[PDB]
Structures are given as structure tokens and as C-alpha cells.
Design a protein around this ligand. Structure first.
Ligand SMILES: Cc1c(-c2ccccn2)nc2cc(F)ccc2c1N1CC2(CCOCC2)c2ncc(N3CCOCC3)cc21
Length: 822
């Protein structure tokens, strides 16, 4: 009976049933609360397409991918057993229309990926992938996997709000101290009251009633009592929060001893209803609440222009009261424009019941919103920290419902992160992630990993995500639970081997080279499963290790270059699968940046641009420790310079390139691929403000493809465009080329393409910093991307700013590159 529950906890890495850290039943309520939407999407999903999870897009095939077709004919090699004859097909041919060549089903060779269902083959991703890298398709006639295998193991006062601060206690502690109690909505403070400062001892009692000005009825659902502890010109030392209105719409009464979080700023961690579970080392405030529920267009020219100017500004542009007052007065005009929504609701006086009352009548008449073409940027904006109203938030999630599954993957990581801004554990977002995850094994797979990532290294949100993940797991299907169990075990095995090996070092001295391979062989025998799914690439099953190819690195974090046999024999390759396990750095950042990169690709796709970024798979699996996809046939720019020498010579790259190209035909492809690659990463890193990088952190493949790595990480350069890069482009110091302008051609197109989604990138960056960079979440750090994207400026002016940047690199050659040495 209850072994299943233990099974689930082992998958999550957290005990959902435990109640050592609550003070109410929200977590347990949300467990119950989620059952229905679990059951619903379970029920309504077609078990056959769920088994095959046909990864397909409904976008156009871009102008770069058309040009690479053999005139409305594509070839698909079908494999019998030891013989494989090919077939002629046209893009619009459904799998059924090809399958007929004279029940059974198609499958890609090596991967657990299927070309089935009612879409042409040009809509399946695998096909688009083969076309892109310049590859030939390879299917295999196979029996459809049994749905049986997926089956789920089925079953009002007018009083001013007063809070009494009794006191704070801390088990181990040098000036005075006060407690700051803020009523809060969004990041907005509605009302604030401090205590008088007492001397700071291991226990400080006050017994004060902090009476607030705001009334009880005027409290809005989502309001947070934010209690904060400062000591003095002060500093914040501890924070903690308490929802003033609970999950049943009930006002919060009674005695609350709350354990608090420390510090080392718009960190998402500061918003949490989670109390610290570490009761021994942690500060704790003590309070008493005593109170009942709450219930459920013809303007001047000049103004409308002022209004339209406002709707038209970027999400990070601050609204003045003047601005806010205007948006609110002209509610109904502003409602006509979907792009006003963030700003409009950011102009609502939330600590005022009649206004919120009005705000809802406004929401009830959202005919224009409910019809508008889905905009992820605009949608995202309404799920950030600036919005705490369920009905506001729920209209954002309404618009997400309409995303096809392909687009869900593009945004899942950040949609998962955005759960950190929800006031309550049960939410339209959380549930939308749940169902969309249960409807699609691919979404479901990464959801698991994305939740487990955060559960494993966030105390502030593990309790919530734990619950969400449990609800996923209880419906994902026994096959996947078996799949997950495998994956957890394998990376739990390897993470030990990664940590134990790190301790025996100080470069890889003799005996340590074996000690690794010792355990890799020892922990291969009767323990390591014979086959597991690649967490960053859930097509690829991997089994047998390549013990002869596994390594460790000289650099001080001692990662594990591992290599694997693909367990699937029908794979027509013999390139191993390459994984790196790394400890020390937080790969949550790397995930985010990489995901953003993928979003820039997809943007560029919408404007028929390809910049052949290489955004490799990388998953945070636990605390300070995760895995990374290994891109085959790739070296750093550093070693290309180390192999020659010291400092740096210009020729070496192209030398390295032509020497790694066989034919001249395949060579120039590289110089081209390199010009495209270099363009993207220069554009991309500038926008994200991560362009100033030492060249051992930039890489290139033996087919010309540049790409940055390690995003965990004296005057500056906008981005890495060093002479050796320019050398491949046929230029020197103060010259130009047939390619270099094409580079500048692509760059300025790329940068302006990224600008045609300013608002979107802005909000993602802003969300990224908040939810995944606990170091740089200051207004100013976030504001970088406005400048970097030259908000407000016209196209032509933005180019002559970007091109300036290129000619700040030209002006510096190796200045900063050398400077990192020390
Ligand atoms: C670069 C490099 C190199 C390397 C390869 C050839 C020439 C110069 N350096 N060798 C390694 C050997 C190991 F055993 C472990 C790590 C590396 C390594 N690192 C270190 C690091 C992990 C730890 O933090 C520092 C950065 C890292 N991150 C990403 C990737 N890649 C490359 C292949 O495609 C996947 C992404 C490699 C890689």
C-alpha cells in the first residue's frame, strides 16, 4: 500500500507528507486540491499518442530550411533488420501517406522518438533537425508501445488591522534592533509600521500592538504580512512572510511562532510563505493576530497620446503617479489595448476594497483580452512578482492554455520558475503546468527535472514544488515512474563518484587516474542499471559505460567527462553519448541562460534567420551539482592558442580549421558556420551582458561551430570578437572582407530581430535575475537589458550603436584576453 508513497518521496527528494515546517494546511490542501485536474487530463488524454509523444510543431518551415530541400522530395530510409531500403516523399506527406509502400508504426533509429499522427513530416521536429544539421532521416518499422504500460496506479470589520509583535528569539547571536511589519501586495508595500529599537540580545520581547492604517475589509487576497528584522543606518538581517488571508479566503488569526530566513534586491526567495525548517540555527519572530472572510471611452486628443505613450513603454519603465492615475481613470480605454494590461493593473490601488471591486468588473468585461493573439511576453509580465491577484494572474494563464506543446517547452523552465511568484501553493499556473505536463511525456519529463532541480536546492520553495511534482508523478504513468526511478538512481550513483573523486586531489596525478576508473567499473557491476534515459535528451537511452574514455579535469572543480554506449542497437551510429558531471557551481543559472538562448533561436526562426547557436543540454540535478551534454568534436579557443604557444597569434584558428577540414568544400562551410555562430553569440551575449569572456570558456566544433560555455561566471569589451576570429573572416586591424560584412550583416539583423521582441526578452531577463541569480537582482542589474537593447531608439540608430560595439572589439584585439592571466 504505502510503499508507493515512499517510492514517490525517493523520486522527489522531499517528504510531502511531513508537517514539521507548516503552520496551516495549505500544502496538504493543495495536495487534495490538485487531484481533480490530475484526474481530468489523465482521463481525457489519448493513451496511444501519449505513448508516442510525437514532437511536432505547427510553425512554418523557415526560408533557410526550405532552400535545403530536393524540390518537394525528401528521403526516409526505412530499416527492416539487417537491410534498409529508402523511400521518396514530399514534405506534406503524413506518416500514414508514407507508411503505405506496397498494425505497424514508424520510429527513429536509436531514439525513443516516433513519426506518427495527423501532421505532415515537415511538422515533426526530428525531420526539421535532420534537415538543419544536414542529415538524412532513418526510421524503423516497429510495433506501437503498449498503453497498458502507461496506466496510472489508480485509486468586513471596519477595524484597522493590528498585529501584536511579542518578540524575537534566536538560539545564538552588536547594536540595537527593530521589527518592521509591512502589509504587502506584489512587491508593493501598502502600509508599514516599525517597533522602537531594543538592545539586540538572544531574545527580545516587545509586547507591542503595531496598529496599521489599512482596514480589514480593505485587505486583498494575496496580501502578505512581511515581518523583517533590522539592526543599526540599519541593515536587514532576517525576513519572513505570512499570508494575511488564507487559502480558504479566511483572515489569519492567532499565535504564530515563525522561523525566519537570513541574508548574505528583488530576489524571488524574499516573497515566500515558506518558513525556515532549520529551527535550531534560525531566528524566529513571535506574533498574535486577533480579528470573517471577504466576498467574491471618449477622451481628449492630448491625453490619449499621453496614455498611448505610456502603454507603449517597456515593462521596466516606471509609472509615475500621474501615469498610474491616468491609466486608472481611463480604465476602459486602456482595457481596449492588451499591451496596457501590466501597466493598468500596476495602477490599481490594491489596499482599497471598492477599487479592487471595480478592478474585477473590469476583468469581467475582457472581451478584447480574451480574443487577442497570444503574446508570451505580455502573458509572462502578468505572472511576475509585480502581480499578486489571482484573477489578474489567471487571465495570463488563460492565454497560455492556447500554446501548442512545442512552445510550452520553450518556456517551461521559466513558467516553472514563475510559480515562485504565486502567493498561494494552489494556482492556475501550477495546475496548467501539471496538466500540460501530464498530457505530454516530453513536457512531463523536463517538468520532473525542473521541479526536482529547485526542490533539491531551494528551501524557500521546495515544499510547494514538492507538492506540484507529486501531483505530476501520481499521473505520469508507471512506465515513466520506472523511467524516473532509473534516472534518479544513476545520477545519485555518479554524483557520489563525482564528490568522492574531488576529495583526493590538490592535476590528475597517476593513481587518481585509476581510482576513478576503479569505481566506474566497480559501480558498473551489479548496481548501475543496464540502460537509462538522458535527462537533457529524453530520446537517447544510454546503457554501457565507456570506461576507457571517462576522465576528470585539471581545473579545480574536478568534473567527470563520462561516455556511454547507446543501449538501443538499432542506432546506426557508434558515437558514444557524452555527459559531464560537475559540482561546485550552480547550474540553475546555466539552465536559464541556455533556455534563453533557445528562445532567441526560435525568435530568429520567426524571421527566417538561423544563427546556429549551440545551446547544449544541461540539467541541475541537486545542490551545487548537475550534468552537461558533451558536444562531439569540440575544443576550446584556448587550446588552439596553447598548442602553438605565452600570449596569442592571429593565424592559429583558421589553421586549426583547415587542418580539421578534409575537403575544401566542407571547409568553407565551417568559415561560414563560424561567421553565423560568432554572430549569434556576439549578439546573444551582448544582450544578456555576458559577452566579456576568457577564451577557454568559448568553444568551436571541428565543423566550424563556435559556442560559449560555463555561464556560472580592469576595463571591458562588449563581447569576444578577438583577432583570431577576425582572422578567419579575412580581415586585420583596420580592413574588411567578403565575409566580415556578412557577419556585420547577420549581427545587425540578429540584434534588430531580438529588438522586435524587446518586451519579451526584457521580462525573461528580469525573471531570470530574480528567480535564479540571488547575487544580482538590483534595479540597476536588471536595467542593463534596456540599454543593451537600446529601448526607445529607432532601428537605424540601434545598428550604429551595435556596430560601434563591434568596433570597440576591433580597437582592443587582445587587451582584455591577456589581462585575465595574472
Ligand atoms: C572545456 C572542458 C575541457 C576541454 C576540452 C577541450 C579543450 C579544452 N578543455 N575538458 C574537460 C574535461 C573534463 F573531464 C571535464 C570538463 C572539461 C571541460 N569543461 C569544464 C566546464 C565544466 C566545469 O566548469 C568549467 C567549465 C565545461 N563546461 C562545458 C563544457 N562543454 C564542452 C563540450 O560540450 C559540452 C559543454 C566543457 C567543460
Amino acid at each position: 500500500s504505502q510503499a508507493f508513497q515512499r517510492q514517490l518521496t525517493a523520486l522527489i527528494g522531499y517528504d510531502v507528507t511531513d508537517v514539521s515546517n507548516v503552520h496551516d494546511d495549505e500544502l496538504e490542501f493543495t495536495r487534495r486540491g490538485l487531484v481533480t485536474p490530475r484526474m481530468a487530463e489523465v482521463a481525457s488524454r489519448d493513451p496511444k499518442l501519449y505513448a508516442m509523444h510525437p514532437w511536432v510543431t505547427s510553425k512554418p518551415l523557415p526560408e533557410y530550411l526550405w532552400k535545403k530541400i530536393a524540390n518537394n522530395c525528401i528521403f526516409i530510409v526505412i530499416h527492416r533488420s539487417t537491410t534498409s531500403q529508402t523511400i521518396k516523399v514530399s514534405p506534406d506527406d503524413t506518416p500514414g501517406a508514407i507508411l503505405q509502400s506496397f498494425d505497424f508504426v514508424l520510429r527513429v533509429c536509436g531514439r525513443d522518438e516516433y513519426l506518427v499522427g495527423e501532421t505532415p513530416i515537415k511538422n515533426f521536429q526530428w525531420v526539421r533537425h535532420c534537415l538543419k544539421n544536414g542529415e538524412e532521416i532513418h526510421v524503423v518499422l516497429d510495433t506501437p508501445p503498449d498503453p497498458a504500460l502507461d496506466e496510472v496506479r489508480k485509486e468586513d470589520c471596519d477595524r484597522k488591522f493590528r498585529v501584536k509583535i511579542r518578540g524575537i528569539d534566536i538560539p545564538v547571536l552588536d547594536l540595537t534592533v527593530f521589527v518592521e511589519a509591512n502589509i504587502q501586495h506584489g512587491q508593493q508595500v501598502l502600509c508599514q509600521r516599525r517597533t522602537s529599537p531594543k538592545p539586540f540580545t538572544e531574545e527580545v520581547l516587545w509586547n507591542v500592538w503595531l496598529e496599521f492604517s489599512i482596514k480589514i475589509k480593505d485587505l486583498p487576497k494575496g496580501a502578505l504580512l512581511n515581518l523583517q528584522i533590522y539592526c543599526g543606518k540599519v541593515q536587514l538581517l532576517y525576513y519572513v512572510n505570512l499570508l494575511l488571508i488564507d487559502h480558504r479566503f479566511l483572515l489569519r488569526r492567532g499565535e504564530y511562532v515563525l522561523h525566519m530566513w537570513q541574508i548574505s534586491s528583488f530576489n524571488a526567495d524574499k516573497l515566500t510563505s515558506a518558513t525556515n525548517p532549520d529551527k535550531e540555527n534560525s531566528m524566529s519572530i513571535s506574533i498574535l493576530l486577533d480579528n470573517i472572510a471577504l466576498p467574491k471611452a471618449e477622451m481628449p486628443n492630448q491625453l490619449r497620446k499621453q496614455l498611448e505613450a505610456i502603454i507603449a513603454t517597456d515593462p521596466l519603465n516606471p509609472l509615475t503617479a500621474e501615469d498610474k492615475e491616468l491609466l486608472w481613470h481611463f480604465r476602459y480605454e486602456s482595457l481596449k489595448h492588451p499591451k496596457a494590461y501590466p501597466k493598468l493593473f500596476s495602477s490599481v490601488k490594491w489596499g482599497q476594497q471598492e477599487i479592487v471591486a471595480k478592478t474585477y468588473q473590469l476583468l469581467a468585461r475582457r472581451e478584447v483580452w480574451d480574443q487577442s493573439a497570444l503574446d508570451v511576453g505580455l502573458t509572462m509580465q502578468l505572472l511576475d512578482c509585480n502581480f499578486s491577484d489571482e484573477n489578474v494572474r489567471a487571465i495570463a494563464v488563460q492565454k497560455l492554455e492556447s500554446l501548442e506543446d512545442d512552445d510550452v517547452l520553450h518556456y517551461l523552465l521559466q513558467l516553472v520558475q514563475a510559480v515562485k511568484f504565486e502567493p498561494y501553493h494552489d494556482s492556475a499556473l501550477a495546475r496548467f503546468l501539471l496538466k500540460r505536463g501530464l498530457r505530454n511525456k516530453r513536457i512531463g519529463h523536463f517538468l520532473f527535472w525542473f521541479l526536482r532541480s529547485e526542490i533539491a536546492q531551494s528551501r524557500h520553495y521546495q515544499q510547494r514544488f514538492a507538492v506540484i511534482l507529486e501531483a505530476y508523478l501520481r499521473g505520469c504513468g508507471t512506465a515513466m515512474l520506472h523511467d524516473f526511478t532509473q534516472q534518479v538512481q544513476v545520477i545519485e550513483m555518479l554524483q557520489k563518484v563525482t564528490l568522492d573523486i574531488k576529495s583526493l586531489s590538490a592535476d590528475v596525478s597517476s593513481q587518481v587516474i585509476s581510482q576513478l576508473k576503479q569505481k566506474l567499473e566497480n559501480l558498473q557491476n551489479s548496481q548501475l542499471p543496464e540502460s537509462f534515459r538522458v535527462p537533457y535528451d529524453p530520446g537517447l537511452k544510454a546503457g554501457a559505460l565507456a570506461i576507457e574514455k571517462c576522465k576528470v579535469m585539471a581545473s579545480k572543480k574536478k568534473p567527470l567527462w563520462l561516455e556511454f554506449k547507446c543501449a538501443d542497437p538499432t542506432a546506426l551510429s557508434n558515437e558514444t553519448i557524452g555527459i559531464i558531471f560537475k559540482h561546485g557551481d550552480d547550474l540553475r543559472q546555466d539552465m536559464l541562460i541556455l533556455q534563453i538562448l533557445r528562445i532567441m533561436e526560435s525568435i530568429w526562426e520567426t524571421e527566417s534567420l538561423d544563427l546556429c547557436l549551440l545551446p547544449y543540454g544541461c540539467i541541475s540535478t541537486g545542490d551545487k551539482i548537475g550534468m552537461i551534454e558533451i558536444v562531439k568534436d569540440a575544443t576550446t579557443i584556448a587550446k588552439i592558442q596553447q598548442s602553438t604557444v605565452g600570449a596569442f597569434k592571429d593565424e592559429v584558428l583558421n589553421h586549426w580549421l583547415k587542418e580539421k577540414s578534409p575537403t575544401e568544400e566542407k571547409f568553407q562551410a565551417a568559415v561560414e558556420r563560424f561567421v553565423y555562430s560568432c554572430a549569434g553569440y556576439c549578439v546573444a551575449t551582448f544582450v544578456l551582458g555576458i559577452g566579456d569572456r576568457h577564451n577557454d570558456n568559448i568553444m568551436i566544433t571541428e565543423t566550424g561551430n563556435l559556442f560559449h560555455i560555463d555561464f556560472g561566471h580592469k576595463e571591458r569589451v562588449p563581447f569576444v570578437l578577438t583577432p583570431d576570429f577576425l582572422f578567419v573572416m579575412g580581415t586585420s586591424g583596420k580592413k574588411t572582407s567578403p565575409h566580415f560584412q556578412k557577419f556585420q550583416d547577420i549581427c545587425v539583423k540578429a540584434y534588430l530581430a531580438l529588438r522586435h521582441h524587446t518586451n519579451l526578452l526584457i521580462i525573461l531577463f528580469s525573471m531570470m535575475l530574480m528567480t535564479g541569480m540571488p547575487q544580482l537582482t538590483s534595479k540597476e542589474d536588471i536595467e542593463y537589458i534596456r540599454d543593451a537593447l537600446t529601448v526607445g531608439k529607432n532601428e537605424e540608430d540601434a545598428k550604429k550603436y551595435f556596430l560601434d560595439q563591434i568596433e570597440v572589439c576591433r580597437d582592443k584585439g587582445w587587451t582584455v584576453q591577456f589581462n585575465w592571466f595574472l
